[PDB]
Amino acid sequence: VISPELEHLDKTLPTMNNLISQDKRISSNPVAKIIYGDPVTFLPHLPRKSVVHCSKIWSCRKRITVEYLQHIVEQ
Amino acid sequence: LLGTESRVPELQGLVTEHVFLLDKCLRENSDVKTHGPFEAVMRTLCECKETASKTLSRFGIQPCSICLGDAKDPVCLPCDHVHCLRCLRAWFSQAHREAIEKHARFRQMCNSFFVDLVSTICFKDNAPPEKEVIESLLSLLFVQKGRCEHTKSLSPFNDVVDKTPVIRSVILKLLLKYSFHDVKDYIQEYLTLLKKKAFITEDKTELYMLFINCLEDSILEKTSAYSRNDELNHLEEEGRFLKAYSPPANEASVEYLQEVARIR
Amino acid sequence: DVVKQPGQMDRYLVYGDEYKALRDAVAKAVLECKPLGIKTALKACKTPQSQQSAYFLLTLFREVAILYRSHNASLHPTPEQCEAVSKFIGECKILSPPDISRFATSLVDNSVPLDGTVTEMAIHAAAVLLCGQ
């Protein structure tokens, strides 16, 4: 009964994160926008002279471990 | 050979011959990291292929020039050809599809052999290959097909191509097995070739993220083998770099991407 | 320009914006102590009665029980809020069962089974088990 949710995470989690970022509780929280949105929309000092200077470049990148590899092997 | 020994045995014979010929083409200059033997192996492979083709086919197994790829689920015309009905219908019995499957299998396994060789015997040292070898390997990722360039997986063959360009990262993972200082020129050449009119059009953020992830992985790979004192020396050197680091319109050279990965 | 100045995440939002509606509804309801728009919100939820009870419990925890954890004595649910929501639970038609109503009246009055993430997960599990079929 559980596994289907583990399979659909990749599409159910972004929805949850968007809802969390949009809730008025932290919608205006700068750290929330940073973690979920693009801080260029509320931070003017962010250099925007290059293509490297983008949030996607500076987005967190999941580290690879033996456990993630095991999960992939299983999936 | 062993694979083909199970799925398409009719070609075992040919194969077991070319095997020796391979043994014979690398018998005097086995430095496959050079131009001569590398081109020799590529030729031998295209010939093992191309003759599996000439023998499996009745007249020819050429892919569909209109699908711009393998003529899968094709129909044999009376026009001395085999084509998918859809394409040349817009333009206006399983022997052939079993044969197409067999040839696709042979090609897949020959490509597997080529990549395994290039990764284990052509990229295996504390030094890199020569210039011509890297240039040929890079050019093997691009094809000006008859009609328009196209990207294909690393393979000497020109029959399997990616219709919508797919900028993979296989040559970079290998080139980065060594110190960036030597392979930076080749990485920059690859980045220029890709960013060129060839495939990429605009908003190349994804290609940059690709190079960045590759370099980060190379660095983590080189630092994982560091011991305690090696680790603390790496820490001190990273601190020195951060202390001395400081700063090309809408364009990211490979050095910038390396600094990005490093500070990340 | 970031460190110049506070809400918190509500993971239960995974249940849909129906839960968000019921949540802010019970929130303002406690803030106003004329709770029947909470009844209209409950009427609005289209999910089954068990899911409605789970939503009710989660919202009560998010807007009342959590407030007790606060070192801020300013927003501790004052007695009028407690009696209002307790009356509502006593008259509710979907919390009529004894265990669910007990857990809800525990959430309102900070007498529940007692870290933040662990507490949230435990309360969610408790609601799921109480209302789960």
From Swiss-Prot, chain C:
Distribution of this protein across tissues and organs: Widely expressed (at protein level).
Protein's job: Atypical E3 ubiquitin ligase that can catalyze ubiquitination of both proteins and lipids, and which is involved in various processes, such as lipid metabolism, angiogenesis and cell-autonomous immunity. Acts as a key immune sensor by catalyzing ubiquitination of the lipid A moiety of bacterial lipopolysaccharide (LPS) via its RZ-type zinc-finger: restricts the proliferation of cytosolic bacteria, such as Salmonella, by generating the bacterial ubiquitin coat through the ubiquitination of LPS.
Organism per entry: Homo sapiens
Localisation per UniProt entry: Cytoplasm, Cytosol; Lipid droplet
Quaternary structure, from the entry: Monomer. Interacts with UBE2L3/UBCH7; UBE2L3/UBCH7 is the most efficient ubiquitin-conjugating enzyme E2 for the ubiquitin ligase activity. Interacts with UBE2N/UBC13; promoting 'Lys-63'-linked ubiquitination of target proteins. (Microbial infection) Interacts with M.tuberculosis protein Rv3655c, which impairs caspase-8 activation and suppresses macrophage apoptosis by blocking the extrinsic pathway.
Residue span relative to the full protein: 4309 to 4458 of 5207
Clinical note on disease: Moyamoya disease 2: A progressive cerebral angiopathy characterized by bilateral intracranial carotid artery stenosis and telangiectatic vessels in the region of the basal ganglia. The abnormal vessels resemble a 'puff of smoke' (moyamoya) on cerebral angiogram. Affected individuals can develop transient ischemic attacks and/or cerebral infarction, and rupture of the collateral vessels can cause intracranial hemorrhage. Hemiplegia of sudden onset and epileptic seizures constitute the prevailing presentation in childhood, while subarachnoid bleeding occurs more frequently in adults. A chromosomal aberration involving RNF213 is associated with anaplastic large-cell lymphoma (ALCL). Translocation t(2;17)(p23;q25) with ALK.
Family: Belongs to the AAA ATPase family.
Domain notes: Composed of an N-terminal stalk, a dynein-like core comprised of two catalytically active and four inactive ATPase domains, and a C-terminal E3 module. The ATPase regions do not generate movement but rather act like an intricate molecular 'switch'. The RING-type zinc finger domain is required for the ubiquitin-protein ligase activity.
Signal sequence coordinates: none
Gene transcribed to yield this protein: RNF213
Protein name per its UniProtKB record: E3 ubiquitin-protein ligase RNF213
Record note on modification: Autoubiquitinated.
Induction comment: Down-regulated by let-7c miRNA, which binds to the 3'-UTR transcript of RNF213. Induced by pro-inflammatory cytokines.
